[PDB]
Amino acid sequence: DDFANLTPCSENPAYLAKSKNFLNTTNDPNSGKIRAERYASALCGPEGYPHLIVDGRFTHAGDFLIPSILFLYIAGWIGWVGRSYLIEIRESKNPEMQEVVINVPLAIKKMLGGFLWPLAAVGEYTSGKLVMKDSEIPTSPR
Amino acid sequence: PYQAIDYATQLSLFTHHMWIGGFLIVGAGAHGAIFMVRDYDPAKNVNNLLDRMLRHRDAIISHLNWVCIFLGFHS
Amino acid sequence: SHSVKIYDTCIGCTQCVRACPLDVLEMVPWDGCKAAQIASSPRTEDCVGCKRCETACPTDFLSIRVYLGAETTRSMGLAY
Amino acid sequence: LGTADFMVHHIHAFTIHVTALILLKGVLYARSSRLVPDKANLGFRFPCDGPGRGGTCQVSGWDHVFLGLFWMYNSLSIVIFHFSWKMQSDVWGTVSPDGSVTHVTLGNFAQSAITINGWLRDFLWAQAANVINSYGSALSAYGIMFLAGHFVFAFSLMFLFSGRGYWQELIESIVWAHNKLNVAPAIQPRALSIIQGRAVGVAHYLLGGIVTTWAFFLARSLSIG
Amino acid sequence: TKFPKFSQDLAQDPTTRRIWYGIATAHDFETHDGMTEENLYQKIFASHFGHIAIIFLWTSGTLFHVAWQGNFEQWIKDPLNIRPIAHAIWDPHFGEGAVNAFTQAGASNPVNIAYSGVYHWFYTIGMTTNQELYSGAVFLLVLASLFLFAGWLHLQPKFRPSLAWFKNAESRLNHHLAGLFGVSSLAWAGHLVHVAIPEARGQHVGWDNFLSTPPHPAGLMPFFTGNWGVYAADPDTAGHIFGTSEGAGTAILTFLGGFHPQTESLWLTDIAHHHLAIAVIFIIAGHMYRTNWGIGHSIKEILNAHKGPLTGAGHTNLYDTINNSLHFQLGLALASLGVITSLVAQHMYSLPSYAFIAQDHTTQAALYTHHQYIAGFLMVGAFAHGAIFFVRDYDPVANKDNVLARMLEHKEALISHLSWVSLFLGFHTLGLYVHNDVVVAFGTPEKQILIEPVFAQWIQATSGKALYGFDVLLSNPDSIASTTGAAWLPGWLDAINSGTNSLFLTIGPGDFLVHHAIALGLHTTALILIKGALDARGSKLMPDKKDFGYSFPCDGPGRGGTCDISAWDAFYLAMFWMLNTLGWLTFYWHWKHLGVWSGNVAQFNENSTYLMGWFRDYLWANSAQLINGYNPYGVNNLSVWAWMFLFGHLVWATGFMFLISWRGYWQELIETIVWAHERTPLANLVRWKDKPVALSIVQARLVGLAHFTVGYVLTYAAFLIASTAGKFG
Amino acid sequence: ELSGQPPKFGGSTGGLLSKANREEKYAITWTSASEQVFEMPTGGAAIMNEGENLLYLARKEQCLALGTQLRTKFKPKIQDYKIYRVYPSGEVQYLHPADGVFPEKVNEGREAQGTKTRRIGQNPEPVTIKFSGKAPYEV
Ligand code: CLA
Ligand code: CLA
Ligand code: CLA
Ligand code: CLA
Ligand code: CLA
Ligand SMILES: CC1=C(/C=C/C(C)=C/C=C/C(C)=C\C=C\C=C(C)\C=C\C=C(C)\C=C\C2=C[C@H](C)[C@H](O)CC2(C)C)C(C)(C)C[C@@H](O)C1
Ligand SMILES: CC1=C(/C=C/C(C)=C/C=C/C(C)=C/C=C/C=C(C)/C=C/C=C(C)/C=C/C2=C(C)CCCC2(C)C)C(C)(C)CCC1
Ligand SMILES: CC1=C(C/C=C(\C)CCC[C@H](C)CCC[C@H](C)CCCC(C)C)C(=O)c2ccccc2C1=O
Ligand code: SF4
Ligand code: SF4
């Protein structure tokens, strides 16, 4: 019986009154109707606008959890391919030069081999190459 | 034709070209200073107008500073 | 006046002396470096603390350091 | 032209003479000065001669231009505000078939523009009703832009009010963080130079202010005719 | 030159920097010429006496001016309508319009209106006539005189304390915990019982007859026999009218809970049992540390015993570090005072104690804003003086391997993770706000990202809020915690479950967004202060920063340029972020409470999700009454507030000269002015004594920050007071 | 006293002030082989004579700036410039070069003062020398 102050938009008089006039974002003439029918399934406040629930419950998993994993996969992909390209370009006798002039073949090669980034990162951490010892890192005076 | 009747166009044109003018004047000052630093040569400017400008500059800056303070204060 | 100190890491490169605009530094004979010379600051009462000497020093951190202290007419660079 | 026009014209004169003072001092003292007698050897674009002589920040001609940009902005802003309010209050409007004229702001310039409170309430507050209320209509792009102008301005203060040593130390810590994961770049990052910091600050400041004024004027003048 | 006698380097300066830096470094005793530890401590002791005397004089002056030119004896007869009066106005520069406008509060002369809420405080503690106010003012004058004389006396050569007397931590802690806290709170409970409550029940008790009338019909017999429950019998009824005997009980120590039905404030008997119990707890705590009788704990043994296997040395040698360093103690005290000042604000705006103070909305807003700003200042000062400690007092060999010296070991990790959390908050918070703004702008506000503050609503439910239907803990009438028969449960649940008060205000999505923004501000200000404190000893750019002191301008343009590198610069930067965070906090509080007081909570509930709502419904909307304080048509009582509003908008801008433009330009200009003065006939007769120079770099930053802060405070103070007074007052 | 023959200059407002005759001034003397034009560090350009020249300035930095200009900005270089400090009592102290040899080059007879025998990282901790009126470099 959570959210006793929240009611589904399908049963919210404010949403019912205000959803007849939803604008069309694209040139598609039915996009307002599509928006109304998709937002009727959410939890709405007294103002007839959908609210999201992020307490972790799976009934509202599409509110945060699914987009959460969707973001995380892409962000990990970008970070892993960047780190791999930097590491492989370091020992090229001019890593600084190849940072402003991108090595397109190697860049794309790292782009493709980056969907398996979680497994690669997990394997690398177990292999000790993901992190460096604190005695092997420059430090500022205390 | 029909420009003065269009108030938005009047205001826009006025403000736009005035901003352009202000930027141009500031650039004039900047590149004049650039010339003075770089292209100036003392040997070619003995007692000319440029030299005599450079020789009473304290008077210029002092009197101009006074007029700025006077204008700011009273206005 | 400001205090200018030269530590034992100087390599006798003379850059600090030339960079000084108020003639405070000097080159003196030494033995701890290959160049067999070191920097001295006999006229620190004329130093204005412009830090050009430090900017010219090529050693790690600075073999020559300038600490700003009591301000006099000379050290403030006043013409009036 | 009356008392208010007199005061505004003399304000224009004041701001213009001050901008001329800054730029003229920059040009005349570029070669050298009493404080620094060999400014020419340091170039046109240098940040300072050091903390010596009590502090020699912003002695080059470049810094004089950097300081003159703000005063040019102030002067031109006052000029365009004068033009806008005077035109709206005494010239622009509508004509009845009898022959009478009804101005946009009903001639309030001659009595409100003589105090700063007038320029705040009767001009900046009263005439901003057309831009803040622009959401939901075709003028919304101005309202957005208006807020955008109010943002970048503030953003520029990060660069004008600070110095590069703090950012260099912060970058040192962040570089340690990226070094721990073996992801440090070959091109060592550095905080922006003093001259670059001043340039970034003045650029973002001018952009924000001018965008604010443009959005305000366009949204106001597209709602009266 | 004689001035400044405490420094010889500044005394030989021929310029005007001598005067500025003499004023600046006057109260920094730790670096005076020929200063000993003993003399330093004694001077500090006398100066602290001085600040206490000044505080007492300030309170006496407040009381005296209220009693003299106020309307207290008429305010008590109708606290819900009459406006309290602060002090009279005597401005010869006034015109007739201002005289007619400021003759307010039913007075007969120009007069101010008090917004410090002292009338409510005086009424609540039983002061009903201005003669009592006058007597209090005179007594405070005498107390201030006594403290000034005490400072003078303990400065004398034979009454001069020793160094060991200043380093007796155990005895000081015992005496100040048991006596300064426990005994004082016990005496306050006694004042409430013997005087305040009988005055609330329409009985006049003063010095002339307090020794006769007992507070309770059974005096001191049940207390010693053990029949304490007698004092809690027959409490005040809900139909009690404050200040009269109508429907009043005879109990003195109760746990009624909730709020008084009329005054909408906590029950005075609750205050009595609360302060008495606190006094007992403090008196027990004060007997903890051994002084000279063998019994008691010793702090050094405690600290050295609590060593950890993961921290190497644990809290070893921290006693010596804290006892030898004054900046460590000052930082700890400032942090604690700031935390409890913020606590005071939070727990007072929601649990009012003084009678009828909830109705007077302007005073509540002013008190919250004032004590919150003070808390922010104190929190900044804690970190600043901790950084000063790291520069001066920290010893890397005495503190070897303890927790303090171990922070520097993993300081880079601290700063990096803190910067990450600040960036993570800022990016996504600004993204959500801008997303909502753009979505609403395109006329489709139904696509806003609106997250319900679930966790805080759950907390409210646990405390017993049944609106959200979580039925957990006190909201669950079947859980153990809600069935213990605790005496406070019925009244407390009655108070929390009514929307008529600020006790646990209902929250929504905009509240979520603004709390996360406040978290961003807090973490960022903490990042600046912590980075400055940890980098005070040195960094890669300046490994020897300690040898340069705490506040130095720069290291010149070498090594890439080193502007704003000292820890003082970190303080100077973090002050801006403190101000910005306080601005966000107070704007949120003020808008929410304006909606609550007007009843139009829907306005905040709708328009607080995007920034245009903040700009329009809060800034633009509420300014209408303020800026019309004086008009071409006339002037009303808000004229002074409009003038101060513009005054702040002016000083704030004036600070930008020092914050943006730097020294060399002004030095060259001053050289030209000097030339002009020296060559002017009839003006060479008058010549200066100290050679004019431009302000130093650090002085410039300080002056700009001061102008900035003064304008920032004054503008918002004027806006808040004017808006709330015009709308409601 | 000193030599004479001032350079041919029209004067300016950027020259000496009261301090010159109340605290100190500075003199620089040099012998040039041609009557040519140089740049005055006080604004404007002046013609220096063929032979010996003497010039009075207000700061030592100005004298050394003019010396740098003389040494570097002329094809026949000038190496004999001398800089003195002129006190208001007429006492003249010969400042630069100190021993007659330029400070940029090593020469015998110098004292090697201002030199620490330790690295900048071995300075004593500030806390240990508290209440001594000395900063770590001072010891
Ligand atoms: C006819 C016009 C004109 C011309 C030909 C020049 C030519 C030159 N200028 Mg000059 N200048 C001008 C106008 C002009 N200027 C004006 C109006 C000003 C006043 C602002 C200046 C101020 C100025 C300074 C202060 C300096 C020069 C310098 C220079 C030299 C080259 C370096 C440079 O600026 O390029 C490189 C230029 C850039 C990289 C600028 C790009 C970044 C700009 C600021 C961003 C603009 C953004 C735009 C307005 C909006 C975008 C919004 C965004 C969201 C996309 C060159 C001789 C420099 C010099 O000393 O060289 C000798 C120098 O230091 N100028
Ligand atoms: C029982 C004995 C006793 C008592 C009463 C005191 C009392 C005091 N000592 Mg002290 N002292 C003692 C023994 C004692 N000392 C001994 C034995 C030693 C030697 C070991 C010392 C050594 C010592 C030193 C070295 C110093 C003091 C100082 C002080 C004063 C601190 C000033 C202050 O803030 O007080 C007022 C504090 C309070 C009233 C309580 C604090 C408030 C807390 C935060 C709770 C807030 C209350 C409530 C919530 C708000 C009320 C709101 C209301 C206004 C509406 C205070 C008067 C300092 C000083 O300079 O004083 C002259 C100082 O420097 N003492
Ligand atoms: C219990 C309070 C307390 C105490 C005893 C001290 C004690 C000390 N502080 Mg500290 N400090 C505190 C709180 C405190 N601080 C707080 C809260 C902050 C945060 C803002 C700071 C920030 C701070 C810094 C940043 C520094 C000190 C320093 C010092 C040392 C003395 C130098 C000094 O500040 O005097 C001189 C003080 C001044 C010149 C202040 C004058 C400014 C005035 C008060 C502002 C007035 C504005 C304007 C006139 C208002 C008019 C309004 C009108 C127009 C309407 C000394 C150890 C300095 C130090 O390092 O010492 C070693 C130092 O650099 N403190
Ligand atoms: C509105 C003004 C403004 C803004 C946005 C920032 C933003 C920031 N400051 Mg800051 N600062 C400001 C004013 C401002 N400051 C002022 C006036 C001062 C006083 C001098 C300071 C002093 C200060 C200090 C001392 C520190 C910061 C730090 C930070 C960062 C902390 C992260 C954060 O809070 O949000 C996250 C960041 C943002 C929200 C900003 C990004 C905004 C854009 C829109 C994101 C996307 C970039 C954009 C697409 C690029 C397009 C460019 C193209 C059009 C040309 C962040 C970059 C701290 C830091 O470095 O953190 C690590 C830090 O140490 N600032
Ligand atoms: C509101 C902000 C503000 C204000 C008031 C000023 C004011 C001033 N600036 Mg400044 N400046 C500012 C912002 C501001 N600046 C910013 C943001 C920048 C960054 C770019 C600069 C950059 C800048 C430069 C680069 C220069 C100035 C200059 C000047 C001076 C111009 C002369 C003048 O107006 O008459 C004097 C000042 C006023 C008339 C101000 C009004 C004072 C009121 C009306 C009078 C008060 C009455 C009386 C004092 C009351 C006494 C009260 C009693 C308690 C003592 C003046 C002191 C120029 C200068 O040096 O002067 C020529 C100059 O070269 N400023
Ligand atoms: C692997 C990788 C990298 C490196 C990554 C590293 C090294 C990571 C290191 C991380 C460390 C050391 C620590 C991490 C801590 C993480 C914590 C504490 C997570 C907490 C999670 C919580 C509290 C979840 C909370 C809720 C969970 C649930 C979904 C609810 O509904 C919502 C909500 C918010 C309540 C990079 C950076 C190099 C590059 C990347 O592309 C990949
Ligand atoms: C650097 C330094 C420094 C500074 C720093 C600072 C100042 C800090 C601060 C800090 C802070 C300021 C902190 C805070 C904290 C807090 C906390 C830690 C809290 C806690 C709380 C809790 C735990 C609670 C709980 C609860 C609840 C929630 C409810 C119920 C009840 C209870 C109570 C249980 C010093 C000087 C010191 C020293 C030297 C160095
Ligand atoms: C924030 C700040 C920094 C730190 C800022 C840095 C290091 C700049 C970082 C810039 C990033 C890397 C890129 C952003 C700007 C780009 C032009 C964006 C390009 C966008 C396109 C790719 C779309 C300084 O270095 C500094 C120096 C002197 C005075 C003040 C300051 C100062 O305030
Ligand atoms: S610049 Fe540095 S290394 Fe070179 S001589 Fe001078 S002190 Fe020695
Ligand atoms: S603060 Fe910056 S600009 Fe000023 S003297 Fe130091 S390095 Fe130069």
Tab-separated table of N, CA and C in Angstrom, chain B residues 29-30 32-34 36-37 54 57 61 64, chain D residues 18-32 39 44 58-68, chain E residues 665 668-669:
chain	number	residue	atom	x	y	z
B	29	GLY	N	42.268	49.613	-30.027
B	29	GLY	CA	43.175	49.813	-28.903
B	29	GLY	C	44.171	48.678	-28.750
B	30	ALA	N	43.686	47.440	-28.858
B	30	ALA	CA	44.553	46.279	-28.679
B	30	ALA	C	45.678	46.261	-29.702
B	32	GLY	N	46.762	48.676	-31.600
B	32	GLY	CA	47.661	49.802	-31.410
B	32	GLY	C	48.719	49.521	-30.359
B	33	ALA	N	48.313	48.928	-29.234
B	33	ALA	CA	49.296	48.514	-28.237
B	33	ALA	C	50.261	47.487	-28.814
B	34	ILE	N	49.750	46.575	-29.641
B	34	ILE	CA	50.612	45.584	-30.282
B	34	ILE	C	51.668	46.276	-31.131
B	36	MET	N	52.808	49.335	-30.783
B	36	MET	CA	53.745	50.058	-29.933
B	36	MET	C	54.780	49.117	-29.336
B	37	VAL	N	54.359	47.920	-28.931
B	37	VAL	CA	55.309	46.960	-28.377
B	37	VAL	C	56.265	46.463	-29.456
B	54	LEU	N	54.720	60.162	-26.248
B	54	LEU	CA	55.330	59.310	-25.236
B	54	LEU	C	56.028	60.099	-24.141
B	57	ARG	N	53.049	61.627	-21.418
B	57	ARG	CA	51.987	60.657	-21.185
B	57	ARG	C	51.478	60.699	-19.754
B	61	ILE	N	47.529	60.900	-18.869
B	61	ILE	CA	46.829	59.916	-18.053
B	61	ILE	C	46.296	60.555	-16.781
B	64	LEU	N	43.253	62.770	-17.747
B	64	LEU	CA	42.147	61.902	-18.141
B	64	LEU	C	41.568	61.159	-16.944
D	18	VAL	N	35.989	56.691	-19.621
D	18	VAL	CA	36.690	55.691	-18.812
D	18	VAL	C	37.269	54.583	-19.689
D	19	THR	N	36.493	54.105	-20.663
D	19	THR	CA	37.018	53.097	-21.580
D	19	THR	C	38.218	53.635	-22.347
D	20	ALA	N	38.127	54.887	-22.799
D	20	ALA	CA	39.255	55.519	-23.467
D	20	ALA	C	40.453	55.617	-22.539
D	21	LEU	N	40.217	55.890	-21.256
D	21	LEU	CA	41.313	55.952	-20.298
D	21	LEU	C	42.034	54.618	-20.217
D	22	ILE	N	41.275	53.531	-20.097
D	22	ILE	CA	41.895	52.213	-19.973
D	22	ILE	C	42.698	51.881	-21.226
D	23	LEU	N	42.088	52.055	-22.399
D	23	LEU	CA	42.771	51.670	-23.631
D	23	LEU	C	43.964	52.574	-23.921
D	24	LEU	N	43.830	53.872	-23.660
D	24	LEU	CA	44.919	54.804	-23.900
D	24	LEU	C	46.081	54.550	-22.953
D	25	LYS	N	45.793	54.244	-21.686
D	25	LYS	CA	46.861	53.875	-20.768
D	25	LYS	C	47.545	52.597	-21.224
D	26	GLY	N	46.775	51.646	-21.751
D	26	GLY	CA	47.385	50.442	-22.286
D	26	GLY	C	48.328	50.726	-23.436
D	27	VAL	N	47.913	51.594	-24.359
D	27	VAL	CA	48.746	51.883	-25.524
D	27	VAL	C	49.982	52.684	-25.125
D	28	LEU	N	49.808	53.709	-24.289
D	28	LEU	CA	50.906	54.623	-23.990
D	28	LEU	C	51.977	53.960	-23.136
D	29	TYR	N	51.576	53.111	-22.197
D	29	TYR	CA	52.502	52.521	-21.243
D	29	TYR	C	52.966	51.133	-21.656
D	30	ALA	N	52.726	50.741	-22.906
D	30	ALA	CA	53.087	49.399	-23.347
D	30	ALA	C	54.595	49.187	-23.342
D	31	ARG	N	55.361	50.178	-23.803
D	31	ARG	CA	56.807	50.004	-23.919
D	31	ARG	C	57.450	49.794	-22.556
D	32	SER	N	57.103	50.632	-21.588
D	32	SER	CA	57.671	50.565	-20.247
D	32	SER	C	56.849	51.475	-19.347
D	39	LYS	N	59.345	46.793	-19.975
D	39	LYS	CA	58.154	46.036	-20.334
D	39	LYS	C	58.189	45.552	-21.775
D	44	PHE	N	54.125	41.739	-25.736
D	44	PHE	CA	52.806	42.342	-25.601
D	44	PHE	C	51.912	41.539	-24.667
D	58	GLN	N	48.857	42.002	-14.207
D	58	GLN	CA	48.148	42.772	-15.231
D	58	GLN	C	48.834	44.111	-15.508
D	59	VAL	N	50.060	44.026	-16.016
D	59	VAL	CA	50.796	45.208	-16.443
D	59	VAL	C	50.969	45.280	-17.953
D	60	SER	N	50.751	44.187	-18.678
D	60	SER	CA	50.924	44.199	-20.118
D	60	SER	C	49.785	44.962	-20.790
D	61	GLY	N	49.975	45.249	-22.079
D	61	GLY	CA	48.900	45.827	-22.864
D	61	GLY	C	47.737	44.876	-23.047
D	62	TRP	N	48.025	43.577	-23.158
D	62	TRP	CA	46.960	42.591	-23.295
D	62	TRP	C	45.995	42.661	-22.124
D	63	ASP	N	46.521	42.798	-20.908
D	63	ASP	CA	45.651	42.921	-19.748
D	63	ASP	C	44.863	44.220	-19.778
D	64	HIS	N	45.431	45.274	-20.360
D	64	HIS	CA	44.678	46.512	-20.516
D	64	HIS	C	43.493	46.319	-21.451
D	65	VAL	N	43.688	45.584	-22.546
D	65	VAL	CA	42.564	45.264	-23.426
D	65	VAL	C	41.542	44.406	-22.696
D	66	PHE	N	42.025	43.424	-21.936
D	66	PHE	CA	41.133	42.543	-21.195
D	66	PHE	C	40.271	43.335	-20.224
D	67	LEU	N	40.851	44.349	-19.585
D	67	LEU	CA	40.076	45.184	-18.678
D	67	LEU	C	39.164	46.143	-19.429
D	68	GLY	N	39.580	46.600	-20.611
D	68	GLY	CA	38.746	47.495	-21.389
D	68	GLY	C	37.534	46.827	-21.994
E	665	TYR	N	48.025	47.298	-12.826
E	665	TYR	CA	47.288	48.393	-13.443
E	665	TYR	C	47.086	49.538	-12.458
E	668	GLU	N	50.351	51.422	-11.603
E	668	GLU	CA	50.733	52.396	-12.624
E	668	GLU	C	49.853	53.638	-12.555
E	669	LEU	N	48.545	53.442	-12.376
E	669	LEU	CA	47.650	54.586	-12.254
E	669	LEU	C	48.022	55.451	-11.056
